[PDB]
């Protein structure tokens, strides 16, 4: 198990876990649990194989993590590409977002080192 990407946690509650399917934060996790008809919470260890699965399936309503991602990766490529600000940024490796650049960033410039501009 699988539901998730071969993976599922475990002792974690579940609303937590299910999130490592990806494309699924708390909002979703609660939801698709729920839906499914199960639950949030119960540990992932307390759900049966038929409940897991029924969950899965119900998940699915969401895309696979590879995909989400990719869609994110192709969205970045795209802005670059279209040649917009972002594209120019992406790309670069600089903050898109409106941050900032005199200080900070870093997240991105990386670590750190004196300029040779």
């Amino acid at each position: 198990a699988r539901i998730a990407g071969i993976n599922i946690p475990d002792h974690k509650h579940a609303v937590i876990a299910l999130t490592s399917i990806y494309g699924v934060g708390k909002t979703r996790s609660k939801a698709i649990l729920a839906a499914a008809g199960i639950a949030e919470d119960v540990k992932i260890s307390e759900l049966s194989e038929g409940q897991i699965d029924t969950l899965r399936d119900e998940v699915a309503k969401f895309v696979v993590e590879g995909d989400l991602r990719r869609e994110i990766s192709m969205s970045i490529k795209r802005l670059m590409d279209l040649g917009c600000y972002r594209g120019l940024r992406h790309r670069r490796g600089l903050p898109v977002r409106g941050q900032r650049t005199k200080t900070n960033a870093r997240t991105r410039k990386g670590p750190r080192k004196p300029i040779k501009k």
Partner: protein
């Protein structure tokens, strides 16, 4: 990311030229200082472009470009430094 008010700005300082363009063809680029103004369906299929501060920068508008602002086409910015940019090119 992010957003702006729904029904985005078009624009008159651009629209006055867009209505002329589609009749004139494209033969020279439209372009203008407006940016921001939104790219609308629409002004698609011609070269605009746009001032940025700066010079006018020609770009043909497909679409894929609708809902963006004219100034995104574009750059105002340059520097540099580390990055900036390509490696890759030589001049």
């Amino acid at each position: 990311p992010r957003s702006l008010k729904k029904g985005p700005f078009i624009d008159l300082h651009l629209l006055k030229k867009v209505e002329k363009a589609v009749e004139s063809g494209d033969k020279k680029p439209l372009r203008t200082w407006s940016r921001r103004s939104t790219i609308f369906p629409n002004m698609i299929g011609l070269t605009i472009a746009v001032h940025n501060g700066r010079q006018h920068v020609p770009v043909f508008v497909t679409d894929e470009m609708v809902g963006h602002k004219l100034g995104e086409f574009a750059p105002t910015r340059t520097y540099r430094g580390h990055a900036a940019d390509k490696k890759a090119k030589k001049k």
